Design a protein around this ligand. Structure first.
Ligand SMILES: CCCCCCCCCCCC(=O)OC[C@H](COP(=O)([O-])O)OC(=O)CCCCCCCCCCC
Length: 208
């Protein structure tokens, strides 16, 4: 009985009382997003492979000798920076740092949030190719080479309609799915904002 509503609302668990982003809950929530993306097939399932790999990087960090330093994004940043465990110019001495890894998860979260919000506010039976491509352009297209940008863009050229994506959320007919997103999306948005502010704060938005 998997449904997207539980996944989205689970993002509330990612922020504690002190507005810190907890990594374990964040990982769990992402696994739920990946399962939804996988259900879609084609381009979505393929791109989700990166997320899976990066989640496992974070799970290894969280299960290692410095585990508690990765309890929250806040703690991770303080640990890796103060101990110089993050490649600042190019990927070399710590190419899979928690900092640069979570950044890629965070960028992917941006794309997914825009896609979902785009679905929420689109007209019935809307084509979804434009929405997918624009959400991509506004999120992580800027980090891809031209030939990759072009390929992704065309990858969405023939996509199911808005209705299919909503019904895939398994929370009722389209209209109910739309209401659900209105209610649940705020939770992801909040986690994204704190994360974004954290990275902006330490000048980490362009880690290699
Ligand atoms: C609505 C959708 C929401 C989706 C949310 C999830 C989106 C995930 C974000 C995209 C993931 C991604 O860009 O990964 C790039 C990876 C990793 O690179 P890096 O970010 O670690 O530097 O680099 C690689 O993957 C390298 C291998 C690339 C092989 C591709 C072969 C096909 C090339 C054909 C184009 C010409």
């Amino acid at each position: 009985g998997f449904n997207l509503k539980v996944v989205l609302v689970s993002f509330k668990q990612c922020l504690d009382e002190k507005e810190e982003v907890l990594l374990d809950p964040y990982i769990a929530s992402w696994k739920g997003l990946v399962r939804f993306l996988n259900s879609l097939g084609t381009i979505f399932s393929f791109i989700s492979k990166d997320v899976v790999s990066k989640l496992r990087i974070m799970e290894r960090l969280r299960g290692g000798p410095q585990s508690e330093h990765y309890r929250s994004l806040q703690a991770m940043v303080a640990h890796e920076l103060s101990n110089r465990l993050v490649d600042l110019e190019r990927r070399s001495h710590h190419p899979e740092s928690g900092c640069r890894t979570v950044l890629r998860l965070h960028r992917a979260l941006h794309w997914l949030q825009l896609f979902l919000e785009g679905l929420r506010t689109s007209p019935e039976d809307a084509r979804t190719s434009a929405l997918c491509a624009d959400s991509y352009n506004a999120s992580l297209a800027a980090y891809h080479p031209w030939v990759v940008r072009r390929a992704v863009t065309v990858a969405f050229c023939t996509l199911p309609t808005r209705e299919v994506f909503l019904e895939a959320m398994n929370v009722g007919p389209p209209e109910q799915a739309v209401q659900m997103l209105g209610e649940a999306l705020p939770f992801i948005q909040r986690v994204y904002n704190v994360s974004q502010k954290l990275y902006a704060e330490h000048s980490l938005l362009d880690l290699p």
